């Protein structure tokens, strides 16, 4: 598959020029994330001994190996005034002892380690990720406990704060190992992190675990003790036996959680056939100019296939039929991989086609792999007389039953139900990317806006009053602001939608990285609902 | 082998400190040298489309490979009132397409890639680690020519400029592959460079090749011409021939750079046995309080052995023989390696050890590892009288002989002949490595000094005059300040007498990757002198 | 490479229609030189016990292992009124015993197993072959003697008979094991093969080994004795001590064979990288349609070389000087090769661009492929002005001295120097094969008539004669019809000048066959004559 783009062309050029400032744009306020709370508070987080966040993740994995981190904009302007780096949390997969684990560390140098309501959203994430795909989970356990004044956004309903332990409890009966470093305080809820776990660590003098902490032991019985006293790591160690390691310092307790791992007595193996990797035909950073930022212009989705497979080797399967969906095998990484993606709106030859691929891949127990540039469904009065609404939902069915692997990237438009039929986020893919130029909601700005002037303007004839064009144009306006507001890729990722804002060259190293985990666990057979022919 | 630490003795926490805010300033010095020429030059080199000098070499490597740099330091402070950020050019062993290759670029920033006379010598120790290492040696070619004020130490002698096209030709004739990638001009002595190569990639049109540039052809003959028409890709490519791949952009250069690879036909042999890798049994990072930065302080080598070997094992060769050395068969990463350490001054017996341990490690094929930390050698009359210096001659023959790769890694005091016995740089080791905390010079600084003031104690005597007390410590001062900058880890690695400056614990990683890349050229047979017995 | 036809053009279709004729021609040819003497010949051998020739060989290989088969229209025509099916010897590369060796075996249905001076060349070939290559010879012996009338071309000279035995004692010299079968009658010469093998087999009645035949030695001594007493392999095996095994049938002698190569104490070493082998991304029988029968067409080599590499993959090499000279790096069954192929007409850039291409690959040990199509050199007073023949003689050196395996297909024209510079048969290729379109010969059949016009016309002005257009026609056309006939595939195949006509869709299979078989040798280093620069 590909071909060489026109380089000279004016419109690879302008392409070119766009993509690479929305890039540009992208690293530069991750330097500013990865720096947490700030120098203040890096400073007198090293003072006492001990280490950074993202240090204490670069000495727990292998030495060299790549790191995946999920979900690096959470919290980015979602509270009105208080700046939350990462949401405080730092999360991603990366290889320990030669076993892909998650990994859940604390930042302490970001509200002292507080959890607020996006804290609970992205470490829940990364416990359904670590569920789902088998890894054993790593706590990197530094925190200051709920933040009250949102409590009621944290503490009571199922997917907060309480359902943390739940998935711990969960995995732990499915043995899927859980292991807690507590490289600091924890308290209250944090204190029940350690126990829950079914092996844990504990430096020192950082590590105090206790249910009720100094200032509530006063209180309710007037008593002043230490924060070690109360906990620290010889009393649990000891006396306690909360601890099951004794660590002297951050350096010593990763050291010890590697030497943990390398006992659990798990050896990787693949349900799926392997062959050789091979590096696509073209280059990656191409696909700037072919995609660019502007929406409205189109792309043929095989140029973005073409330079993310292996080799550049497609088989499209139905080429002629239901064009507007491309449908193919390939391979990633030696992985095979079927291959759903947007080339257009969605027909009911495209939803028929798309319906019939997935169930060749559940059959055979290929990952599904989905592409969404949408624009929504095709309307007329004879596709619906001809059952599109049956069509599509015959796609959402399939694809919502299919349990092999599912990983979606969104490389553009993402809009009402052609987000569903193309496995959206509520239908649990293993991982969500999206690209910079990406944009998601219920329909496109646009269409919103044309669809109040159109009932505006009907509305105010039924009364008799007259809506100008000037009046069309007060409506339209706030609707488009709103829309693009709200359909930002910054937006989407801020609040965990996806896992994460990625530098579309760097595609294929995301999807391998991906594909790799997802294949810890065995893939199940599937099982389909009707199918309303 | 080794024993945990006393973390709670006060020499440990100081020395921890010490030599803790030593590994600081080594890192934010590096911080600086990486933005090379400085903003403004960075903007202009990418305005121009072209890639930073090391984004070139990350995107050149295999993804997540690891790169070892060499002389990060060269010309750190080396002329008066210039900043020349790594001497100019950037140097290091990497992975290309599954290939351990040797990478020369220049960095363009950096006074715009004219070559200093530390940029010469940094090239020319890189081109001979790859030709001892059989490495394939690849250029980034992107300079602007030599520096014309000092063109005397530049252009004439055999270890000047010259000599950068004979290591060329010599390593062609050997089948150690060159290639050349002209991201950029080229001229006089530079246009050389892809004539040279065995094969030669160019840029469409930031690379220009021409042997007189424009301004000397309108000097010579009065024509006025650009210099993409005098040089350019398309005249070479087309017209000219002396480019054999014409690239687009950067990122197509270094994409055509790891095709050409690709097709040497080269399969790593090794002649060594392999055993699984594992991780030594104590902490890295224990060595800083071990170690620290006073060299007055003795410390046990062993301790140092115990934190970079795998799994701490270690069998002692003659270990109540001349204690004040320390030589065993370990292995580092699977290899096997004899390690030759100091732990106090050299005698007589501790010389005959080591040339009894060199002839064994040479027999057998098995590479050598020198700890240096010399005070020097035992000084009295009942040792000269039993020929020290004919037992430290022997030392010396057999290091100075030897086949094996030798890597030799300063850490501590390099003194005297206690240098030369112990592998020093005049002894080709294929990579000498020196910690933060280092001296080296011809005599300790106090030794200096305290001759000095013996001898002119003696000559004020002799003509009747009288050295006074404050006349001791006016003679004193001077010498022992001239000592202390001379002997400064970053004055030797400002100047190339080692090929870099690493963190303590660094020290396993950087030894593994060095031993890597010294096996893939194969073990020949040791030839020794005469052994004055 | 490659890009798709266009399979309605009417080019495309005439070609098809003409290219699918002349190999249709060449099947059914080779079904009747596969009868060998004819049905009452091939009942008389049947009838005797004995098994075919072609059934030998079936039975002797590896079960379903591919028979490389060579030289099947030797002596086509060549003798005028005699017809010698396959020169009346039947020679090819297969596997026995997992082991591959050139098979020799004698057709004793053609004109009894006589050997015309067309069988000795073929034989002579065979051996050359195994030799270059280390490839055990079988001789499967069944021969009626030297064929008497055309005794002056089979006897004397040093590619005469003589040269079989004296390539049997250098090849066991060698190490290169010699096994002769003697499965039938061997007389005179012929009984020096089994003689001369290192082991030999003798069926019990069918083979008879003798100096001299019963009709000599009746009239040398007037003494009646049957073949069987004075041969035999009863006399052989038990009392004259030739017979090394002895076999009751050809299934046995056959069986035994096996035995005795499985004994050799051989395995292949591969001196060459692997990497897992790819089909092409273009069907094999599009060449027909693209090449077509007409040489005064062109076509792009690079179609060709699309359709029989991995993948389709391929490196060119300068691609952009001398263009009508394709050279660049490929694999074909994962074995790494250079491919040099015509594109037009040399020119001195051409030239220079192959002899820089030849000493990369012999640097590199890399095995080389030869694609003649040619039309001559560039003619014209500027480019002899410039040493045309001076870059034509630098590939030629190049081409010679090259040590690294050497194949060469002509796909089209071969005529003048042209044919020396792509490594013709003069030039020692491990293999030659021709496709059924091609032509050779010392010049184009054209150019030697217009050049006899030429001569003749200002010859005839010298005479003060006249020469007209009807002369002119007179004089070209017995010249046409001449370089027709003897550059036609048939006759250069009939005489051993190419190893053999093969369709092209059979190219990749039969080049990955080749190449196979000529690694069973190890490559040696090239060593240059002096490059006239």
């Known amino acids: 598959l590909g071909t060489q783009p026109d380089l000279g062309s004016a419109l690879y ?65 979602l509270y009105d005034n208080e700046e939350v780096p990462g949401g405080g949390i730092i999360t991603g997969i990366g290889r320990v002892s030669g076993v892909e684990c998650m990994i859940i560390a604390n930042d302490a140098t970001v509200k002292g380690g507080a959890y607020y309501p996006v804290t609970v959203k992205k470490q829940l994430r990364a416990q359904e990720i670590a569920m789902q795909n088998r890894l054993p989970c790593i706590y990197l356990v530094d925190s200051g406990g709920a933040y009250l004044p949102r409590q009621a956004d944290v503490f009571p309903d199922r997917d907060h704060f309480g359902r943390t332990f739940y998935n711990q409890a969960i995995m732990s009966s499915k043995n899927i190992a859980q292991i807690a470093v507590v490289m600091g305080s924890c308290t209250a809820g944090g204190a029940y992190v350690p126990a829950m776990a079914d092996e844990n660590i504990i430096v020192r003098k950082q590590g105090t675990i206790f249910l009720a902490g100094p200032p509530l032991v006063k209180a309710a019985t007037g008593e002043e003790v230490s924060a070690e006293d109360l906990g620290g790591a010889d009393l649990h160690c ?171 990237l969104i490389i553009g438009g993402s809009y009402g139900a052609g987000n569903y039929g193309m496995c959206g986020r509520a239908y649990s893919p293993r991982f969500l990317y999206i690209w910079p130029n990406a944009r998601i909601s219920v329909m496109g700005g646009e269409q919103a806006a044309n669809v109040l002037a159109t009932i505006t303007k009907d509305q105010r004839a039924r009364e008799g009053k007259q809506f100008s064009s000037a009046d069309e144009a007060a409506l339209k306006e706030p609707i488009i602001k709103k829309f693009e507001e709200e359909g930002n890729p910054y937006y989407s990722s801020a609040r965990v939608w996806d896992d994460g804002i990625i530098d579309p060259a760097d595609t294929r190293l995301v999807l391998g990285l991906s594909f790799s985990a997802a294949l810890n666990a065995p893939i199940e057979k599937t099982d389909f609902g009707i199918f309303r022919m």
Chains 1, 2, 3 share one sequence.
């Not at 003072?47 to 919290?75: C, H, T, V, W, Y």
């Not at 990787?268 to 191409?286: N, R, W, Y």
């Not at 212009?297 to 973005?304: A, G, H, K, L, P």
């Open 13 to 77: 050029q302008e392409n070119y020029k766009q993509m690479k400032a929305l890039v540009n744009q992208l690293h530069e306020r991750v330097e500013h994330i990865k720096l947490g709370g700030g120098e203040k508070a890096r400073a007198l987080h090293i003072s006492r001994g001990k280490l950074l966040p993202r240090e204490r993740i670069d000495n727990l994995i292998d030495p060299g190996s790549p790191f995946l981190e999920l979900s690096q904009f959470a919290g980015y302007q």
């Open 238 to 408: 000891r006396k306690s036996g909360v601890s099951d390691h004794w660590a002297l310092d951050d350096h010593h307790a990763l050291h010890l959680t590697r030497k943990v791992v390398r006992n659990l007595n798990y050896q990787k193996k693949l349900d799926v056939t392997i062959e050789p990797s091979e590096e696509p035909l073209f280059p990656a950073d191409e696909l700037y100019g072919i995609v660019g930022a502007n929406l409205k212009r189109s792309f043929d989705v095989r140029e973005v296939i073409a330079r993310i497979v292996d080799g550049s080797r497609f088989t499209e399967f139905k080429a002629f039929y239901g064009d507007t969906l491309v449908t193919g095998f390939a391979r990633i990484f030696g992985y095979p991989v079927g291959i759903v993606g947007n080339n257009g709106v969605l027909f009911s030859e495209s939803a028929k086609k798309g319906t019939h691929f997935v169930q060749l891949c559940c059959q055979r127990n290929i990952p599904l792999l989905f592409l969404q540039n949408i624009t929504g469904f095709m309307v007329g009065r004879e596709y619906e007389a001809e059952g599109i609404a049956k069509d599509g939902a015959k796609m959402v069915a399939a694809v919502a039953c299919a349990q092999v692997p599912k990983i979606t």
